[PDB]
RNA sequence: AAACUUUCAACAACGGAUCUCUUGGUUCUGGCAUCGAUGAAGAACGCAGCGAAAUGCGAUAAGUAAUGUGAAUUGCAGAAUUCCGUGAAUCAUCGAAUCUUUGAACGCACAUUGCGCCCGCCGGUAUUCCGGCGGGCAUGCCUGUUCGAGCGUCAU
RNA sequence: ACGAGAUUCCCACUGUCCCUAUCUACUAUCUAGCGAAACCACAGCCAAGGGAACGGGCUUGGCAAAAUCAGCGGGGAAAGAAGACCCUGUUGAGCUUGACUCUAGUUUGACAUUGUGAAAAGA
RNA sequence: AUGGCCAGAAAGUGGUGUUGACGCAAUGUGAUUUCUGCCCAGUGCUCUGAAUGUCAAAGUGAAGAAAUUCAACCAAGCGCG
RNA sequence: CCCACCCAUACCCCGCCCUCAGGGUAGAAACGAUGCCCUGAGGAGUAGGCGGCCGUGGAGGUCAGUGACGAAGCCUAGGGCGUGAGCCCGGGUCGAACGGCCUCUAGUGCAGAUCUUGGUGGUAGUAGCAAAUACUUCAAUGAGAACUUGAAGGACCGAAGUG
RNA sequence: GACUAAUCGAACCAUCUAGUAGCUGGUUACCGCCGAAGUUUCCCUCAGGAUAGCAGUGUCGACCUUCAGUUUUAUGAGGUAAAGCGAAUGAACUUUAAAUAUGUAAGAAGCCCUUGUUACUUAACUGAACGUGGGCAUUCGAAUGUAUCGACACUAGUGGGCCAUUUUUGGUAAGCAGAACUGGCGAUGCGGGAUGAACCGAA
RNA sequence: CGGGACCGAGGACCGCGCUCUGCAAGGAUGCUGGCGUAAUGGUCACCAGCGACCCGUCUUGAAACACGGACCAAGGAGUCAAGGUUUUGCGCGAGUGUUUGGGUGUAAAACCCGCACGCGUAAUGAAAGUGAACGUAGGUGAGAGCUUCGGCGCAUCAUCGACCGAUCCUGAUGUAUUCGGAUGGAUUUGAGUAGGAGCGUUAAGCCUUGGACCCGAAAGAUGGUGAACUAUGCUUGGAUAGGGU
RNA sequence: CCUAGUAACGGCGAGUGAAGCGGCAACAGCUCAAAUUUGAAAGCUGGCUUCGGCCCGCGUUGUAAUUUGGAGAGGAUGCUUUGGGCGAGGCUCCUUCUGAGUUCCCUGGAACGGGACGCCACAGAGGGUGAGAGCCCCGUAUAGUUGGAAGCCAAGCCUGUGUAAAGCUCCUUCGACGAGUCGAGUAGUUUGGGAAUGCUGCUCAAAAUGGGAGGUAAAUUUCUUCUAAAGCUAAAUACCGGCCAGAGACCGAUAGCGCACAAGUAGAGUGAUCGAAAGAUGAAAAGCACUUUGAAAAGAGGGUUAAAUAGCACGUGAAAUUGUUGAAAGGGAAGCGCUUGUGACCAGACUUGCGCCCGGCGGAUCAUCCGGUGUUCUCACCGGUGCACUCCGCCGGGCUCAGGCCAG
């Protein structure tokens, strides 16, 4: 606003190579790291997950229809078995996995 | 990084008409709606995936359905625009899954249609009859018939015992040795092929 | 002391600020698609009882017909209106008309109210002369009609 | 020869001068009528001092009496002087040249327009 | 004169030109009288006189699987004379 | 060399204003706590920086706001408040609207720009109204006659004319 | 370089166009709180730049740690005056020792000792550095002062100006020209120098 | 122990005290007179004593010079948009942003809706690509606050480690025997990880681009209008005593 | 909208800058050329008509039907499909018509102002009327209601039926598909496509699973996508022109368009062009009868008006500047600051209040108690009770205190 101005308040005193039709859905692969993976998990039936009631059902989670296309490893995971489907993986992320006593697929 | 560098105050547009737009928007509607009435308002479309490996995930309407998909839904290719189905023949089935969805759909839709003979007093045998004409109807395809699951479940449950195994050596080792396969596929060819015409010179 | 000059005040001048007003601008939004050889846009010259302009109109000239309304117009003059009506009005609407000289502008021209041509009609003694009136006469192109030209190709 | 071209001199001639005087008409002047403009921070007596070489206003003195008229050209004002001159420019423009980059014109070659026959010399 | 000097964006365009060397065009000097210091040959002016020396595009030959690269030939002008 | 005396916005004491600093203030008889009470220090200012206030046109809310028993505007050697920009009142004039408070908003505050438009002074009853030879008498008209008319006189153009 | 409608080294009209200027002119109420600056250091200069320094608003951190254009003390520079040479020797002599301002240092964040290593160094496990452990709080180890802290953020002017004292280097016939510190002024009123940028008193 | 001047801030009590029935002890009362109105006080005009350059601009260090100002009224110059940046307020928060659009409406308002999308949640490398926990998310020294008084230690700072990517060296088990790239080192590096802080909006300052605070050049370009003046030419007209040689 | 200030382009760098995907608004598809109707030019402009047709022609150097790549042509096969005429009703546009005070009092020239009493309201938007009007007038709101015209949509209902045309399913076979064009070189220009863009000119100039594209030049081998060189087509989109309409935190006569007015006018310029200034009496002209003085303009009386302190110079009527009247100052400037004085002219303050003691009046809203009610639950109010040594006012005195200005 003109009147909180302090012109106002002054009035009387005055590298590398080149990429040709780059098509960025080419390079789409947005990462998620493992320990925002149980956040995928809809809160209900992962508070039971982490509670213990759920003993002999593992998740399967799609990370694509998350939007995410590669699982990197930055974290840690509880010790609950769990399927993830990825189009890529870190191998730190896949070790973890496996230490939880899940399964990593790949996917298309 | 400023583009004002032209004589740019001769081409500003502001929208002060967005309201009255979409009033005149909505009014076009309603008399398309009344003109159209009791057919619904738009055509029916056929689900289609989207292209490129960013949108591959995701399903949405087309423009129309395909010749062979009105051929096995049995809707002849003249019949179908005008009882409310929009076709294209640019667009082909190469693979089983979204011709056999598309068809069901049609189905569905030749199952819900109620179709009034062009003369009253004389109904033909593929014309809905009388008592069977009233019922509640839809005006709307794209609401009715709309994408029930754009995207692919992302949380599962299985058993325990369920579990993948797994492919052996791992899901990065697998990826590493796929990119290895498809950059040295040339090379290999080239080296086995050498190997047979040395083979069959000192055989 | 007055006069003069200057200061202060009242009233009166000069001038048109201030305040209030606003049949006008400005900006936005919504709707609509309709100029002209069937002569447009523009220009000129005229037209009212009494007008120079603005407005309206075209020798049927501040207008005619038609439809509607239903008693004015008004500055003056003069007339109204059978008011129980084919009817006032500088009224509204508007489907019928009129629409001067021009202008893309079209007989040829135009710095001329210059000069023609074709066909009718009327009047003046009139087969010959004179006058008036009416209808016509641009260019490019298309379809068609008709009259033609050329050893250009042929038949006989 | 000719010249409203520039220069020196001689005779004649005279108010150019010694050395100024006088006369006439129209003004200026005074009156009636009519009636501008330029310019204008405020104003208008001087002397000495007022570091920046400048005072009209300050300091210290001289002094100093209404309102006016004709004249005058010291000062202030007054020159389309915001001129002219000098200095500066990311200066503007006209002009010149083997300055730079281009170019009209001109000139040279090739392709096309471009066809029908000969005679040779090479493939 | 299938020319010179001009003009025009171009033209089946125009001018000089209703012209033709006693003419047309471009320069310099500037009536008459006087008047051409002496001798060349550096710049310039002009010579199709021999050269390929420089040497564009098109064209020609070679290598390569091709893109391409390498070679000669090479108008006028310049150079040389 | 000596004694007294004169006065600066300097120094001392006192009052008042502002700023800064440090304290107090709820089983609230309790306060524009954004207030009040106690104490100390400090006070020039260009470029520059920051805060608070005043004023103008318009908008929402509010004041059961003012007004033909006189709104706004204007004049005033008439008063009151404020350090100040300003605010309020009396008297005169006048004729139709306007103001306070909290927010919102801007084409919002002038002495300058050889500023723009309009209006008005001194100069000043001044400069001036001096080329083209020149006017005079009587009568009439009229409110009024050098510059209207008739007559009577005097002149000028001078035929490349004032025809 | 004349004339082409008072317009000519390129007419007039409208438009692009509110063309561009670093140059000139101007730029609109009040009070309150702070408040400046002129080679510091680097870059090819003039038709040059940055930059330090100096300022104001916000915050935030334990506004914790104290620090200081000052004296004293130890020690440098200035040994230079001076006293004596019945001290030695002879400003260059010294037992001793100037004035003026001036450099460095003056604690627990410190001082040492010991342990080892060294890729330093030393003849060298020798010094030093690196760490390790321990001892020292009995006085925290001069004076005076201390509303003086620190760190960020953002914003602004000025950043090769004038005069003067002192010191120092050069000069001129005489004038004077460079530096360094400090003070004043540009930004500033008051009292006195009759008067006034540079004087005295005092803000 | 006298003589004189100026001043009286505060507003129940509380305190320090003393000469203690009380007081000069944390700030003036008591007594009296005239007048009760223009008498005091105030405004305006003028005289008197003292004081006192004409404003604005420009310049440099400053003056001086120079420029603008006859007078008055009204008009008159840091604005708006886009994009950054820092700071203030607000909502939500690992998310955040309804308003392109749709629904709806008392109709340009208000209310409601969600797919996509933007920004953030991951970095690094030219790229292919790879991609953040040894440890109560580490050790040590500080550190507000809390404490069971033994300690625990926020933010932040300092310092030593660890993890991801880039660069260089080594090259394990294996094997499409030519692929794969583990392990172990070494440099710098990145606003990288190491118990998320952002997104939207409001307000202010500043920066960039637009006419960009306002007025001012000589200019450049595009398209038009003039030979009634004047210059030259063409066609057709007109005009110029009397003397001398 | 987003992609995205991204990929990319760029002297000496200032700068420039798309597209695919994705969400949405809106959606709509088709016509030729290339085929022999060949058992029948089945096609068409024009002229004349008795409205039945008949002529003059066009055209085979090709007018109809059929086919257009999604296909189609030929076969096979068995089912499906169709043409006309009414039409209830609805919508669009002009037309007739719509509620309630001019009730009473005051101010006023005039109520539309103030006060009182009403009424209407799906209407309290706006304007007019002698001052701020829902009810005085036009209009305004809502359903409708009169009369007329032209279109569109449409529930349904009558009828002819297969000469012909049309769709579906399958198939050995056939399956024409646009040339100085595509493409290449070169030149100019253009683009983010200055290695990957488009356009145009000149030269060269194609092909038949061929051709184009697949953003780094080339050869070889593949692959993926379309099918150029012929053509038509609503909507969502633009809009400083035109016509009609509704609005605004816009401007309020130096503003706002140059123009609120006989404004693109007057006026200027040979011409192209340039281009203003300028709104407001009063509710109503009631715009001054009549007398008088002047040649007249006018003046003075007297009138109109609510007001001429509104007189066609006209609402209000500032300043500069001027005249008169009153006061004052003035020996080569005035103006200004501090402080007295003189003269002129003013604002305040004050006028008495409170509290006692007596006397005289006028009344019982004294205290206590009872009942009801309310509250803060122990405080109040209301009704009865007081019978005047108690309360509350008034009037006379007396006393204390506090009161204005200047002083000792």
């Excluded at chain 2, 105050?9 to 928007?25: L, M, N, Y």
């Excluded at chain 2, 989207?50 to 839904?73: I, Q, S, W």
């Excluded at chain 2, 598309?102 to 062009?118: E, G, M, S, T």
């Amino acid at each position: 606003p003109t009147r909180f101005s302090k012109t106002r308040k002054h009035r009387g005193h005055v590298v590398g190579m080149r990429h040709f039709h780059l098509l960025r859905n080419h390079y789409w692969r947005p990462s998620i790291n493992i320990d925002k993976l149980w956040s995928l998990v809809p809160s209900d039936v992962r508070e039971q997950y982490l509670s213990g009631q759920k003993k002999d059902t593992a998740p399967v989670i799609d990370l694509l229809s998350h939007g995410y296309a590669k699982l990197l490893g930055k974290g840690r995971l509880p010790e609950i078995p769990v399927v993830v489907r990825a189009r890529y993986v870190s191998a730190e992320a896949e070790r973890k996995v496996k230490e939880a006593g899940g399964v990593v697929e790949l996917v298309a | 990084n400023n583009h004002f560098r032209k004589h740019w105050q001769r081409r500003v547009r502001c929208h002060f008409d967005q309201p009255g737009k979409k009033v005149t928007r909505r009014l076009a509607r309603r008399a398309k709606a009344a003109a159209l009435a009791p057919r619904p308002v738009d055509k029916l479309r056929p689900i289609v995936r989207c292209p490129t490996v960013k949108y591959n995930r995701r399903t949405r309407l087309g423009r129309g359905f395909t010749l062979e998909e009105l051929k096995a839904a049995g809707i002849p290719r003249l019949l179908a625009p005008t009882i409310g189905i929009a076709v294209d023949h640019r667009r082909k089935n190469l693979s089983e899954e979204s011709l056999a969805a598309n068809v069901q759909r049609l189905k569905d839709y030749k199952a819900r249609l109620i179709l009034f003979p062009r003369k009253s007093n004389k109904p033909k045998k593929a014309d809905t009859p009388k008592d069977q004409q009233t019922a509640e109807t839809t005006t709307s395809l794209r609401t009715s018939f709309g994408v029930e699951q754009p995207l692919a479940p992302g949380f599962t449950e299985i058993s325990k015992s369920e579990i993948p195994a797994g492919i052996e050596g791992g899901a990065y080792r697998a990826l590493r040795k796929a990119r290895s396969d498809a950059r040295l596929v040339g090379v290999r060819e080239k080296r086995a092929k050498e190997k047979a015409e040395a083979e069959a010179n000192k055989k």
